[PDB]
Amino acid sequence: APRKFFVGGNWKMNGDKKSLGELIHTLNGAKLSADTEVVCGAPSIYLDFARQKLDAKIGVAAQNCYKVPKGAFTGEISPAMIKDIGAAWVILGHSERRHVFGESDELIGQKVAHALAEGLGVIACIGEKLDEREAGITEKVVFEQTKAIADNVKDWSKVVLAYEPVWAIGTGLWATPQQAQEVHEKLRGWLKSHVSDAVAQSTRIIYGGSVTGGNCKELASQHDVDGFLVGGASLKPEFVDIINAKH
């Protein structure tokens, strides 16, 4: 009945074998809550390395992939390759790929469908920007993005939604736990009416804003926040505290 708490740690473009080696060794020896499903999002070049060194209980995620198994797409990797090195997840639709690299809702949706058909789990990301949040069209934007994902999801048991308050990234604005709860609650209500009641009750909607050891207990105590997609703090030893945010 209860959704399993889910902390993913998006490392982004960071680290080398030495620094990521020390990070992994710290997670391996740390007292982690058995209630939490932990997943580390490693750079593509370090996905094989991260899987070898990390304990089997902690999952590994690609930070991005493409929509077909093979082909003339220099620079890209496919779900077939991510599966081949032992990883079981992929992060798609991150705000950074949307913004810096112009990834459309259509393109993200194709990636979601393919990743899922190949047997990977997907951490799908959504979120509205500053001018959108200020305009009061938060719901219209995240529902548009969630629909572009959901049209390509037949089975929700391998999917986790991640809300990114992009409006509070790099601008003077900040997100409160109450504001996060209000978006998560509306996303769950969207899944209830557009997919099914059971999908809404079992699907983890994790918060992907600024999550630190100092603010995670309050964000996790929110009814409809089922975990985090942690940015910068996933590289530090306090990522352990964030995993244990309910204890």
Next chain:
Amino acid sequence: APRKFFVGGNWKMNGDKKSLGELIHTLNGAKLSADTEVVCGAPSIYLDFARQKLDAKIGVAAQNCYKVPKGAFTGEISPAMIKDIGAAWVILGHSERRHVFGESDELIGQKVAHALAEGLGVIACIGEKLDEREAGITEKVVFEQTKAIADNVKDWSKVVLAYEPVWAIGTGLWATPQQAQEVHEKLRGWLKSHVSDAVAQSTRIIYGGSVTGGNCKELASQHDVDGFLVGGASLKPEFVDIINAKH
């Protein structure tokens, strides 16, 4: 005085540990010419693996990277990471990155600057599309792309230009050895007047069109073709014949 023959092998988005393992085993046991600099362009998730398995005499190249060492750029790898796993090259501005993923001349120039400063070698790719070749403005296009790269190159000794006749990629048209020589010759002349004569005589300008064991002998015998950037044929054992194109 002569420019060392340079055969790079762009694997693109293809293969797994098993298939790439057999590929690498064939190249390691093959009778490769000492006069040919061989470099394998592996997918990012298999870069580490490729460097370990491949003999030291064959270089390893990333198929793409970003313009800073670290940062909030989910899904991207940096030159510092490529250097960390033992690779010494990177393929930038590939036609597929330009067309499918909208990589601009500016972004490519920024990437080239960073890659060279971090100590990597660069196979920079340029080429005119069908509508540009048809309009007769081939010179104007490849001079623009080469300039965007040259403005960000301080030292050309670690750089290799790869001409990609994109107008002959899936259009039904094919580039003849005379037509390849015609572009390569004009590119070397561009380097002569816009940089220096010494740079023009020492810089390898390799052919990035469709290269097989059937057509490489005639292409390589052209005066200003100094090697190849091989596509599909770099996965198969005939890549050995292409490496030995002059013998």
